Design a protein. Structure first.
Length: 297
């Protein structure tokens, strides 16, 4: 929601700036007009008066960054009544062309939400988790929520079967279990995002992006890809917007980043949280465009 509700939602649902590949290259060259464009996009943060689940604040890492009701991920453990047991700071995110539930954006788990997080990964049959933050960056950003080899979290067991190092991220193959059932999940941990600025190069992110895309292509029938950083909106929003925009560039030869970010704001308030992040998404789109086959006919 926003102070002027209709003005803000009308904007989010109508703003558009379709960029040809040439225009995309020019826009980043002019990293000045992106800032004013960014400032025009409503945050769509959730008015706490809206949501009504007593003490949900205990499970929010950032008190003002909440899951918009319409797309909130509700937990369904088959045996709890704590009410807060059905709550998690996470939202379903629409993908390219509005594809329903392509991703789930969520905050970095807190000690008291680790079980909830796995309950989500389990009930949603999520095939991939993308983590874009260190556990600490000057101050706490996220809690360690997975085991070195094996762990129990509520009624969900997580087994770490393998670990592979890469560019600026590490991949952990995971196996989740509940009784007679198993679920595979690949955990990507991107640790090199700078503490005080956006990545100098978008190459590591696009590599991660491509790896996750191959996972999605082979996981038809499964659930949304889970993405989180600390508050679950900044780096998280950058990763998702970049993924959606690179697909538009590849399939259509153009990209509407403004529309993409607006739709993300609709799904989760604050997605792509700073102007620097907004510029970074465009730089990442530019790097991707630089690798496409030529337009000259």
């Amino acid at each position: 929601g926003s102070p002027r509700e209709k003005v803000a939602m009308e904007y989010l649902q109508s703003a558009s700036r379709v960029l040809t590949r040439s225009q995309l290259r020019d826009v980043v060259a002019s990293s000045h007009l992106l800032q004013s464009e960014f400032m025009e996009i409503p945050m769509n943060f959730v008015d706490p008066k809206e949501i009504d689940i007593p003490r949900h604040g205990t499970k929010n890492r950032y008190k003002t960054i909440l899951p918009n009701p319409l797309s909130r991920v509700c937990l369904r453990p088959k045996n709890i009544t704590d009410s807060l047991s059905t709550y998690i700071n996470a939202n379903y995110i629409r993908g390219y062309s509005g594809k329903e539930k392509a991703f789930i954006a969520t905050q970095g788990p807190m000690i008291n939400t680790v079980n909830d997080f796995w309950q989500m990964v389990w009930q949603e049959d999520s095939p991939v988790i993308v983590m874009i933050t260190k556990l600490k960056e000057k101050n706490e950003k996220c809690v360690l929520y997975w085991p070195e080899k094996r762990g129990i979290y509520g009624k969900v067991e997580v087994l770490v079967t393998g670990v592979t190092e890469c560019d600026n991220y590490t991949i952990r193959n995971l196996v989740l279990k509940q009784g007679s059932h198993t679920q595979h999940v690949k955990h990507y941990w991107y640790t090199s995002w700078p503490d005080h600025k956006t990545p100098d190069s978008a190459q590591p992110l696009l590599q991660l992006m491509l790896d996750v895309e191959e996972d999605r292509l082979a996981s038809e029938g499964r659930g949304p890809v889970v993405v989180h950083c600390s508050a679950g909106i900044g780096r998280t929003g950058c990763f998702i917007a970049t993924s959606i925009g690179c697909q538009q560039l590849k399939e259509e030869g153009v990209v509407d980043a403004l529309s993409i970010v607006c739709q993300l704001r609709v799904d989760r308030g604050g997605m792509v949280q700073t102007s620097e992040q907004y510029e970074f998404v465009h730089h990442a789109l530019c790097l991707f465009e630089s690798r496409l086959s030529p337009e000259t006919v």
